[PDB]
Each structure stands twice: as structure tokens, then as C-alpha cells.
């Protein structure tokens, strides 16, 4: 799927919730849907964890988003990343937890302002 490309991401995602509830029943990152075409701004994907980078935003081949309940414990150490609807950052779609490169202090990641964009011009 191409979330950001749709005409109403807010709707699609809020729908994949109950469809996932009709089955094995909060969102999680990686029974679940798959989104492709996103863009991580501020960091980069490496060893399955948010890592620093000199380049602005990088693409995201794809990723899975499950609606579990559990794995939500070591978040106090992990980083929180917002999933807006585009660079504008004027519309948040959903928050998401992702592990980061614990090399750089957590406070640095905060002031690092890391977010994910769905739609990206070119």
C-alpha cells in the first residue's frame, strides 16, 4: 500500500485496526498490514534501529505495523516517532515506537526532531 498517496490515510489506518481486531482480538512497528513508500526524516534504518545520519530524509522500502498490546515495556528506553502526513508536519497520522542507536544520548534524539512522512514529492 501507499498510505501517503491515498486520499484519506487517517481513515485507512483507523480501519486496519478493527479488521485486525476482528482477528486476534495500540500500534506497533516491525494480523497486521504493510505500508510502503514512507520516509524517515532525521535518521536512517540500520541493524533494525533508528541511527544518526547527515542526510535529511531517507526512503523506506516498507515496514509492518501490527496492533498487539507485551512488547510495550522497553519503550522507556526507546524513542517515540510521529508519523505525519508529509514534510509539512501539519497533520499527524499516528505515533510509533522505534529503537534507536543508544550511542547518542536520548536527549539528543529529542532535540534531533525525528519524524516520519507518508507522502513525499520528487
Amino acid at each position: 500500500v501507499w498510505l501517503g498517496g491515498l486520499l484519506n490515510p487517517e481513515a485507512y489506518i483507523t480501519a486496519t485496526r478493527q479488521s485486525a481486531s476482528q482477528l486476534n482480538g495500540r500500534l506497533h512497528a516491525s494480523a497486521s498490514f504493510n505500508v510502503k513508500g514512507m520516509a524517515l526524516e532525521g535518521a536512517v534504518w540500520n541493524n533494525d534501529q533508528l541511527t544518526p545520519t547527515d542526510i535529511l530524509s531517507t526512503p523506506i522500502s516498507i515496514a509492518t505495523l501490527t496492533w498487539k498490546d507485551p512488547i510495550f515495556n522497553n519503550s522507556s528506553s526507546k524513542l517515540s516517532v510521529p508519523v505525519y502526513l508529509n514534510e509539512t508536519r501539519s497533520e499527524l497520522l499516528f505515533s510509533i515506537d522505534l529503537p534507536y542507536d543508544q550511542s547518542t544520548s536520548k536527549q539528543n534524539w529529542y532535540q534531533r526532531s525525528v519524524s516520519i512522512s507518508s507522502w513525499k514529492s520528487d
Binding site: 487517517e10 481513515a11 483507523t14 480501519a15 478493527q18 481486531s21 476482528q22
Partner: protein
């Protein structure tokens, strides 16, 4: 937005999105609902959906005012609906937990479905189960009126159709809740 001559005399406070969950939880407590807490976590979700998963009509509203309005009715409805070791509680306890869910639905069905349209009446049904599994909407126990309504109907040479009589009742109920009711229709 404050005039360019007041953004330094005042102190701005952001109040974007409120706290429905809380508002609802306590809202029910004042009515007598012992489940409230648990309940609220479902009544709110239903609303958030009905606004983006039910044919977007012009007479459709699921704002905060709506959520409060309905919860308030559930109180009077419950005030008139007599409730029903180890594995003794778990089973007996659940039963009560349901009684409250029913009273809640009876309110939704009282001042939430009359607003619904054609293509939306079926969708709301599905949505209600995903939220309130242990129950489903009930009929209109108002024999008192239904009796006098069926009399006037035949008197005015009116076809006492089923679906028809239903609406006349839809008013009696919604009126004793929202002193300001408006009947939209072609």
C-alpha cells in the same frame, strides 16, 4: 490571534483536543454506573468511528456535546431498569457488567439511531457489536403510546405502517432527553 497589542498582556493556553475518556468515565459515575470506567473506553471509540465510518450526512454530529448528551440519558434509563467463591463471582460479576452495557445501548438506540439514515442504519449495527458484543438494540416498550398512536392513525385514514409508527415514538424518547429536537427530512 490576539490583537498585536495583547499577545504580551495575556497568557496563551492550548486546548486543541479535550479528554473525552475522562469526561465520559466520570460522567457515567454521576449516573450510577459501576462499570463507567470500562464503559467509557468503548462509548468514545464508537463515536470517533461513527463520524468517519458512517455516511457523512449534514445532520450528523458526534462532537463532545453529543457524547455528554447521551451519557446523561443513560442515567434516567438505568434509574428505571431493574438490574439482574471462585467461579461464582467471575460469572455473576460479568452479568452485571452487561446490564450496564445494555442500558448504555438503550440510550444510543434512543438518541443516536433516529439520526442515522438508510445506508447507515446497517453499518451502525455492525459497529455496535465490535464495541458492545454482549448485547444488541431492543424494541420500544411503550405500549401505552403505541396503543393511542394506532388509534389516531386509522382515524386520520393513515396507513398504520410499522416503520412509520416507529418514528412517532422516536420523538417521544428523544424529546425527553434533548429539549431541542429537530426533525430533518425531504
Amino acid at each position: 490571534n490576539l490583537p498585536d497589542n495583547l499577545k504580551k498582556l495575556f497568557r496563551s493556553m492550548a486546548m486543541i483536543k479535550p479528554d473525552r475518556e475522562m469526561i465520559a468515565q466520570v460522567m457515567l459515575y454521576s449516573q450510577g454506573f459501576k462499570t463507567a470506567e470500562v464503559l467509557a473506553g468503548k462509548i468514545v471509540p464508537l463515536f470517533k468511528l461513527c463520524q468517519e465510518q458512517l455516511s457523512a450526512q449534514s445532520h450528523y454530529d458526534f462532537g463532545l456535546r453529543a457524547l455528554k448528551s447521551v451519557l446523561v440519558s443513560a442515567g434516567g434509563i438505568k434509574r428505571k431498569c431493574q438490574p439482574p467463591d471462585a467461579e461464582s463471582k467471575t460469572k455473576a460479576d460479568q452479568i452485571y457488567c452487561q446490564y450496564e452495557i445494555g442500558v448504555l445501548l438503550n440510550s444510543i438506540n434512543d438518541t443516536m439511531i433516529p439520526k442515522l439514515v438508510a445506508d447507515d442504519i446497517p453499518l451502525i449495527q455492525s459497529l455496535l457489536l465490535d464495541v458492545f458484543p454482549g448485547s444488541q438494540l431492543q424494541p420500544i416498550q411503550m405500549d401505552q403510546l403505541r396503543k393511542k398512536i394506532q388509534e389516531i392513525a386509522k382515524q386520520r385514514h393513515l396507513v398504520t405502517k410499522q416503520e412509520w409508527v416507529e418514528k412517532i415514538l422516536q420523538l417521544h424518547q428523544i424529546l425527553n432527553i434533548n429539549h431541542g429536537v429537530m426533525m430533518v427530512g425531504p
